Ligand binder design. Structure first.
Ligand SMILES: CC[C@@H](C(N)=O)N1CCCC1=O
Ligand SMILES: CC[C@@H](C(N)=O)N1CCCC1=O
Lengths: 586, 586
């Protein structure tokens, strides 16, 4: 019974590999490579949009705390749902069909998010865009694997991981070239406003549309047809692959020699039942040790990588904040009287001042604090305030005309006979401000990805030469050693170098994990299992981000120990996995 | 009302601390340190006796399954009752009074257990010995804390755990030096027998007697007298402390400068009511968050620690059992006839044999199984049987002379005209049996405690330097990381190293928890609350042991996940506790 099933699946796999050797590589494989690289580029772009627009988003939607912290977790949760959903649906509907549906959903909801003005609606649109793009990596890898021969199956799959990095580079470049133009205030409707970050979101929603356009021209994988008892169109697809390959070779004169490939409301409930059957069969007697080791490896690597990747920029920001706090100026004791006096003062503290009959017209305040001051018959006009506070201050007969000094900028103050007139529009809470730091953020991201590059090249070249397990274990161990090396970092330059090193060493491990998870599952459960594991990866990413953003400024022992321990456990479970190099893809 | 009570308690605490600073440290504090360390040594010794004597105990009391599994739970339940009882009674009768009572109870019932011959009576005696020793740690910590000044209150209390450490070493040494002499068969009465494990139990009951002898010479804590409205003898005790301290210094000429100190069946029933009230008042408006966080931390830490600590030796035993089974031999089909044939065969299976007129004189059988055999006019003499069975066997005209082949060793057998003569004395049920493994058990226990040592030293040195909460949380997190590291264990050596690591990392956390629970309760509820929490610790120990002994041989994921989750929850609730370093003991 079950033995017969396994046997027949075995000669099916062998015959399919023979047909693939007959067809060979050439134009078809590379064409599909680029076509799927567009979807991976979209996946890579999607994880940078909210991170890049949080400043402007909180400016134009008046976002408080616990709202900026949810806008990254929203995309990660969206991918967590979408990966599982589309991975489950791909084994019953098809790789190309589900990829088209998911990419279309992503594009539509990304456009809609680009045009949303509210916050809750923005959360919903971002979550659904993440759902749409969540099933990109599983379907792409499981769809490209079914067109590659046994020989160079690792190198030909590892070159497919350049596109995530290219998407990251694209996002960084567009953010640098679009967002810095804060002047843009395109108007459509009194109640609504359109700034430049919306344009950035639009441009970052573009490449998914190109992915759909390229994918509509590609044929469904023959293996999916063969599994589901559909023989004729599988043969047609294989013939198309052969014809394209040989026309590209220049001998477009031979004929495909294969005639045949040996073959062995209510609707919603049926689909649910079938998907649950596939998911449970993933937890079968045949697939249990492999499944659990894969779960462990995916979870640990995701936790460590995402935790450190979010930790490095936060630590850079913290070091800059410490420098700023160290440079401040203090002016203890002042007595200014009867003068019109503006200024553009930044990063200052005034204590013990006594101001009488002073006119403050047209001044910019950035990180300026007045403490223990007294203002008496003063006058504030055209005051622009950023990170400015009044603590232990007393105001007597003062007038605030055309100022943004809201109620939250007076901390434990006392106003007597004070008048507020023509208050500027603004947030009811400190929303902080990001200025010149954006350029350095973009530069840091670009450096991270460029550091990723050499590991990609080396892993792609040596994946077949040394092996999947050797690559995975080697890169995991090197990453753990780097995690130890994070102790020797206390400046921005050192943190950038550490980011570069860790990003450059972990990518080989991720490449090996992708190829491994491709090769250890049969063609009737590849997308389901690999999508489930990628959903677990996204959940671990959420957990790791939450855990690692809490150690910035406390100590550097907790991040190092957590990352090193998780990576060591991941390498330990990775060394127990079966070897799949030199094996027919079955 | 209540505010006045809190205030007056406050200046009482402040004046008491001033008096303690005036008295200082010296000979009195170290003398009391050793005196209470004897009681902690007794506590440490008590938890090894049944574990060390279960082999010999089941040999000489014929213990079945469900009886060896209850002889550990009996001591844990005894301590669970005793901790609560003596902690409750200590706040109404006194620390030294209740410690004397509990230690005497422990000693008496330990001697009686040493001389018991039955099982039920042995259960009762061990349970009451556990009850006697249950209130050791609460009263000892809460009694020593009331003689220490603010300055080094953490260091001087953390040195108090080297004692439970050594007790373990003492128990291991005595077990190694006493039990291996199985020859000892001291006889007193025909129906009763005295082996060497009884001598071991006697020697392990000794140190409680020394604890009582040393405790009878120490004075009651002044704080207990001051709380209960008794002023004169509190002043006398403080004067004694001062006099001893200054005589030790070498200046026995100064005078105690303190003259006045601020002061705040039916009998048994009243005391019980008072205890109940104190406990309910713990479910006080002032102490409800603290109480619940303490409950959670104690329960989780006890569950994890005890579960893993019982899991490690069980896993070692399981690995040894697997190795032994992997050594097995099968001899299918035999025909032996007309020969005198002994042997010393271990771990074998004979199937399909046919024996005719065979004499079996003086053979040792260990883990030997005869299946589908036929014995005809056979003769068994001086047969020693261990884990030996006869299944689906037929005996015809066979004689069993001077053999221990009892009725339970013939499984679904058929005897025809068989004769049993001069059967050896022995159990009516299988008892298995432990030989050389005892030395390795003792060595493993010794290694565990020696691994505990460095954590003790470091915690004692750094308790004041870093803080109680930092120490607790740090050690809890490291313990969780170790729980993750239990994945890398598959041999006896690896399991021993893992036991050493986990024991070495959890002890700082336990030290910090003890000191913390000492310092967050007022002197009129210290013993009640701390004893209630220690009773909860023992109940959690029972639950954790029962849960964790069921995962041995199934998988290593359930233990790791349970322990890590519980320790993470414990650390989470530990980080929310108030800081008590740099605070007057109130
Ligand atoms: C280029 C790396 C890429 C991969 N396929 O390994 N990565 C890294 C983490 C998430 C992801 O898709
Ligand atoms: C002597 C240490 C003692 C304590 N009170 O901290 N321990 C450690 C593990 C369980 C226990 O009671």
């Amino acid at each position: 019974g079950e033995a017969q099933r396994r046997k027949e699946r075995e000669e099916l796999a062998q015959q399919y590999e023979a047909i693939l050797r007959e067809c060979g590589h050439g134009r078809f494989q590379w064409t599909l490579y680029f076509v799927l690289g567009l979807a991976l580029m979209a996946d890579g772009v999607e994880v940078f949009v909210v991170g890049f627009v949080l400043p402007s988003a909180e400016k134009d939607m008046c976002l408080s705390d616990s709202n900026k912290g949810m806008l990254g977790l929203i995309v990660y949760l969206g991918m967590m749902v979408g990966a599982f959903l589309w991975g489950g649906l791909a084994d019953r509907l098809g790789r190309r069909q589900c990829l088209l549906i998911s990419l279309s959903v992503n594009s539509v909801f990304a456009f809609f998010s680009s045009f949303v003005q509210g916050y809750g609606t923005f959360l919903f649109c971002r979550l659904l865009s993440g759902v749409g793009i969540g099933g990109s990596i599983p379907i792409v890898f499981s769809y490209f694997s079914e067109f590659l021969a046994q020989e160079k199956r690792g190198e030909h799959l590892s070159w497919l991981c350049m596109f995530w990095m290219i998407g990251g580079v694209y996002a960084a470049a567009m953010a640098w070239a679009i967002i810095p133009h804060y002047g843009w205030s395109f108007q459509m409707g009194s109640a609504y406003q359109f700034h430049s970050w919306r344009v950035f979101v639009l441009v970052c929603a573009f490449p998914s549309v190109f992915a759909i356009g390229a994918l509509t021209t590609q044929p469904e994988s023959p293996r999916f047809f063969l599994e589901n008892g559909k023989h004729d169109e599988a043969w047609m697809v294989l013939k198309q692959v052969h014809d394209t390959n040989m026309r590209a070779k220049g001998h477009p004169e031979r004929v495909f020699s294969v005639t045949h490939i040996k073959t062995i409301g209510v609707r919603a409930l049926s689909l649910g039942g079938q998907v649950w059957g596939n998911f449970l069969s993933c937890f079968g007697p045949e697939y249990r040790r492999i499944t659990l080791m894969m779960m462990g490896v995916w979870f640990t690597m995701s936790f460590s990588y995402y935790g450190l990747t979010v930790w490095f920029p936060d630590m850079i920001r913290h070091l800059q904040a410490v420098d700023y706090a160290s440079r401040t100026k203090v002016f203890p004791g002042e007595r200014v009287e009867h003068v019109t006096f503006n200024f553009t003062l930044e990063n200052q503290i005034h204590r013990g001042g006594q101001y009488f009959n002073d006119k403050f017209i047209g001044l910019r305040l950035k990180s300026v604090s007045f403490e223990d001051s007294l203002f008496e018959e003063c006058y504030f006009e055209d005051v622009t305030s950023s990170n400015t506070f009044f603590r232990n201050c007393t105001f007597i007969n003062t007038v605030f005309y055309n100022t943004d000094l809201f109620e939250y900028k007076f901390v434990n103050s006392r106003l007597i006979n004070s008048t507020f007139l023509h208050n500027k529009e603004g947030c009811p809470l400190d929303v902080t401000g990001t200025g010149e730091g954006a350029y350095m953020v973009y530069f840091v991201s670009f450096l991270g990805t460029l550091a990723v590059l050499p590991g990609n090249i080396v892993s792609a070249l040596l994946m077949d030469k040394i092996g999947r397990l050797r690559m995975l274990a080697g890169s995991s161990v090197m990453s753990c050693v780097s995690c130890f090396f994070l102790s020797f970092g206390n400046s921005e330059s050192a943190m950038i170098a550490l980011l570069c090193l860790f990003g450059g060493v972990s990518i080989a491990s991720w490449n090996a994990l992708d190829v491994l998870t491709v090769e250890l599952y049969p063609s009737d459960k590849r997308t389901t299992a690999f999508g489930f594991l990628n959903a677990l990866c996204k959940l671990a990413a959420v957990l790791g981000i939450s855990i690692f953003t809490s150690f910035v400024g406390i100590t550097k022992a907790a991040p190092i120990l957590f990352a090193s321990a998780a990576l060591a456990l991941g390498s330990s479970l990775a060394l127990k996995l079966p070897e799949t190099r030199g094996q027919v893809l079955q």
